[PDB]
Design a protein around this ligand. Sequence first.
Ligand SMILES: O=C(CS)N1c2ccccc2CCc2ccccc21
Ligand SMILES: O=C(CS)N1c2ccccc2CCc2ccccc21
Lengths: 300, 300
Amino acid sequence: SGFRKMAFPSGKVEGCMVQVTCGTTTLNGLWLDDVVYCPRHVICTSEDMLNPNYEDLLIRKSNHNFLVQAGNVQLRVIGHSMQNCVLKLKVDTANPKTPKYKFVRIQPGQTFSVLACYNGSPSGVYQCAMRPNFTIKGSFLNGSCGSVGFNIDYDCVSFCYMHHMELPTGVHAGTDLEGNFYGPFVDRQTAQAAGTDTTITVNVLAWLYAAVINGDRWFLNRFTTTLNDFNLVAMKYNYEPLTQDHVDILGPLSAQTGIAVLDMCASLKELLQNGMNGRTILGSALLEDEFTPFDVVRQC
Amino acid sequence: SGFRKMAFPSGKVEGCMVQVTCGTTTLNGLWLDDVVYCPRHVICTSEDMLNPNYEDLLIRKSNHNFLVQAGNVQLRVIGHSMQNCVLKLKVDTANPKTPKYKFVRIQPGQTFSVLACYNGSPSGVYQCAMRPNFTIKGSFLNGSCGSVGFNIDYDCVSFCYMHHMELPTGVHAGTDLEGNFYGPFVDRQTAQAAGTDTTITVNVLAWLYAAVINGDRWFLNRFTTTLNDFNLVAMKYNYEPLTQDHVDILGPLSAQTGIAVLDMCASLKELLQNGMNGRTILGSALLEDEFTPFDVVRQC
Ligand SMILES: O=C(CS)N1c2ccccc2CCc2ccccc21
Ligand SMILES: O=C(CS)N1c2ccccc2CCc2ccccc21
């Protein structure tokens, strides 16, 4: 038993991290088959980032201006192209450590593991969630750009995230592996509004089920509620509205614990209206929303 | 910026995980050079675990009773011996993926990453702390025994923990890689007292420094205190006593933030006597003690 915020084993992704240098800018890239993926602002200086014309800046670059280094060995760049906000560097050799992989664009509320890297070397791994406003609350120092987020299904790595920038508010923004940003953001050093964030209601409920499975039951109440009554409380407390799709995804957890989804919703409503009174759930003094229903089933 | 509970990249350890089966019991083992390390209770049935005589049970076993499988390939066992609570199976081949490594016995309050495994396959990685009472609050299902904890220094893996059992209280206990248990525990299915746990004071302080570095400063107070006055408050709230060794280890963080250690202690004292009033520090509604001063410096 016990419950931890677990990340996926990162070995398959560590074998794909390289260092990409263009001019005096260096960041991380993802080497899969004979292509290296990295943020396109690798071609920018700090002054460029105030208002960059990426097409004009890329046109000044040739294949030999991109230094791609995997461990101690150098890769030969035989082609380069821009796809949305990522650079795709065609190299002469296929990464012998390429895992089976897919590129996927996740939805808000879904979770993934981040391998934080610097100069192409991994430093740590952690599990996080795509916020409903399409930011992530990561740990990204300078030079961490190009670090990637992923999920693993047995032997297949689904890459879903590449880190591009930190907003003035301290949260982080990035793209899928086709270079399309999650959210309204652009790769330019200008003030950019993230929307109102909300709590991922279905994730909180999944984690309340994880708590019951692990013995924390003090929050179980004698009440029930309706989907519409609960969503009234949800909107007040800036929780995402619960849908019947969310009720269905929680089904297996409902079956395992013997607690109806709407009964668990009534417990959550009581927790939102009355707080926790200094008590804890699974060692947390607040409601956790970084576990999906799939995460809870996988761990439990 | 940002701050996450990061685990070490686990790839070097994933290459060392094998499946060990003895009779009908299967768990995880650690394959380094030509030796496989695993918990000795792999030779026990559930009924054996009530009161096992390991020497007598091991004597009934021969080299060919140990099935060691690394991925799809089988290892040939050419020797077996018991060192305290671990089994050491000498196999005919050196693990070609053996990283540079050391065996270390950590101290309470220190942290490490756990690669949770089942049937020799990794499922997740997470960062945790050795509690002052020598338990760990992990996530370990049946068959997770033999999963290991570790730290990584550049290219060197310091193995410090092997999981052996879950106590009736739901916390977990294990050994170093020489087979000596952390704590008073024994590998037998009997009720065993973990002592009073305490909060790792030096870790809380390190994480308060991480908070200041990341912009959370509301808890900074106009007070200071003394080491002895603070320890008076520490004992009341079941915090470990702060020593001058702890003050020295916090030095670099004190220098970076410009906040004296004893001033930070005064802020912590105020937090212990008055609570957080529903506010948060680095997204947590309680005081975190799973980051060492070294962890904070490494991340920041
Ligand atoms: O985040 C990173 C690097 S990881 N960069 C970004 C990204 C977005 C907005 C601004 C900046 C300023 C710093 C800078 C300079 C040169 C190349 C990239 C970056
Ligand atoms: O924890 C595990 C397996 S991971 N086991 C332990 C350990 C300590 C006390 C009791 C038990 C009971 C279950 C059992 C049965 C057979 C071999 C080992 C174990």
